[PDB]
Amino acid sequence: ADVPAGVQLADKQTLVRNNGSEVQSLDPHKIEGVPESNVSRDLFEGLLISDVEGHPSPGVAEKWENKDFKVWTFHLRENAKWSDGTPVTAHDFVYSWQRLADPNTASPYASYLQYGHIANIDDIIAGKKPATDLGVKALDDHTFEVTLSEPVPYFYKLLVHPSVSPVPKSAVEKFGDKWTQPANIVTNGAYKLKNWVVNERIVLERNPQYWDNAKTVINQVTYLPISSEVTDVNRYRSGEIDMTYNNMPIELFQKLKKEIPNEVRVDPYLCTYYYEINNQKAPFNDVRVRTALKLALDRDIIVNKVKNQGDLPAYSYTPPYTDGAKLVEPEWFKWSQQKRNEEAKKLLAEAGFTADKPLTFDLLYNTSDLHKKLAIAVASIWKKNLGVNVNLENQEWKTFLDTRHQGTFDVARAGWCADYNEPTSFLNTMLSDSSNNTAHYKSPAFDKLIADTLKVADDTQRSELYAKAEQQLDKDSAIVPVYYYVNARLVKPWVGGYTGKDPLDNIYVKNLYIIKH
């Protein structure tokens, strides 16, 4: 943390953050969400990290170079250490990236190495080559070299993500799935795991072996698993919570803006809220059905009337303000909602649905007051505008993600936030073979458009291809875009270090501090 001159620090440097839900896991290769990444950044540190404003900056790697954007050489700092005092080396990275690639690990982020194009990843994911063939090597204990199959000018931006953080081989091997328990875990971030009580709390304590420990200020941070946005606000206002999770309750938001304006933080956020259709399950394998659902949802009602927290109506998957996004707004987005409704009803009628045999399906969401209120609204809108019936279902976060990966669903609410600020952070997740493809969407045309983006050595042609890829996704109605998020949360006035400038919201508790109050 960089405490400004003149700031008086509180005697007790402890922080309590709400984290939305119980995490899927503390193993960097088994996680896929925001609650998981929030804790992961305090515990595991990769090659690069985001600074307090979100820029890619030195992590375990103090400096790096690239040859033709294809061979990347990372010089690791000599004092990087794990919490048990042992050095973090390039061999840790070699093992870790191999473990991420290995199909036996079944990582939801195995395809992150395809997004970066590390050599031999396609064959390793397919079981054709062992994970030890991955294009990574430790040239010495402090030098990690990565070899890509084609030039990727933005490759280093990928490296702040939890999936490419190191994991401690000795603990993994000796304890298997219990390696992350407090008695067994070993970490290399600013913090160490002190306690983990499922559905109660995760408590982290400062890691004295962290190389940048002298600048860490918070000595302990607690992450809670509260999925009720009302309860989160309540426990924030009672004094227990210093930072809410970034899901705000529809019941209280307008009043909070009038009552504690300076604590209500609202900033840009590279995430899209949408309804994820299971593209492989009848009748959702019919484009007319997906198109009808997409058009009949009234974004103005959801964004401005129901939620009304500053979000923007969406017509794409990739947020239009992503670095490199130059998207074309489809004509259907400028139509009236009545024109959208008629087209929707016409398409559903063409697909075989009638008043006597209407379309009925499930709408799955992760337990949350905000997502329930939005799903109820979407249900009413779809019923009114299109004559479709929906059965709402809630599942706790970990179960919900597993369900979507399994494809045991019809339609599910969904949010995707960027992992790196570049359109492929969204677009690669819709590739046929992506481990992140929970839409179960497979389009050779879309795959080809994205494959072409790194074949050209030009940025503007690249932006045009991303735009065409989005048009292909839209033409197929792979998803139902709802809104581009704003990041809204409450932060106590005595929590220093949180700018709100990072559009990825990659917070590190090592950067924060408690001001005397």
Curated annotation (Swiss-Prot):
Pfam families assigned: SBP_bac_5 (PF00496)
Q: What are the subcellular locations of this protein? A: Periplasm
Q: Name one GO cellular component term.
A: ATP-binding cassette (ABC) transporter complex
> Which SUPFAM superfamilies does the UniProt record give?
Periplasmic binding protein-like II
Inducing factors: Part of the opp operon, which is constitutively expressed.
Q: List the disulfide bonds.
A: 271-417
Molecular function, one GO term: peptide transmembrane transporter activity
Alphabetized UniProt keyword annotations: Disulfide bond, Peptide transport, Periplasm, Protein transport, Signal, Transport
Main location as per UniProt? periplasm
Additional comment: Isothermal titration calorimetric measurements of the binding of lysine-containing peptides of different lengths to OppA show that the dipeptide Lys-Lys is bound with 60-fold lower affinity than related tri- and tetrapeptides (Lys-Lys-Lys and Lys-Lys-Lys-Ala, respectively).
User: Which family would the database say this protein is a member of?
Assistant: Belongs to the bacterial solute-binding protein 5 family.
Q: Which PANTHER family match?
A: PERIPLASMIC BINDING COMPONENT OF ABC TRANSPORTER (PTHR30290), PERIPLASMIC OLIGOPEPTIDE-BINDING PROTEIN-RELATED (PTHR30290:SF10)
Q: What is known of its domains?
A: Accommodates the ligand side chains in large hydrated pockets which impose little specificity on binding. Tight binding is achieved by utilising the hydrogen-bonding potential of the main chain of the ligand.
Q: How does this protein assemble?
A: The complex is composed of two ATP-binding proteins (OppD and OppF), two transmembrane proteins (OppB and OppC) and a solute-binding protein (OppA).
State its role: Part of the ABC transporter complex OppABCDF involved in the uptake of oligopeptides, including the cell wall murein tripeptide L-alanyl-gamma-D-glutamyl-meso-diaminopimelate. Plays an important nutritional role and is involved in the recycling of cell wall peptides. Binds peptides containing from two to five amino acid residues regardless of their sequence. Also binds cell wall peptides, such as L-alanyl-gamma-D-glutamyl-meso-diaminopimelate.
Q: What is this protein called?
A: Periplasmic oligopeptide-binding protein OppA
The root-end lineage is:
Bacteria, Pseudomonadati, Pseudomonadota, Gammaproteobacteria, Enterobacterales
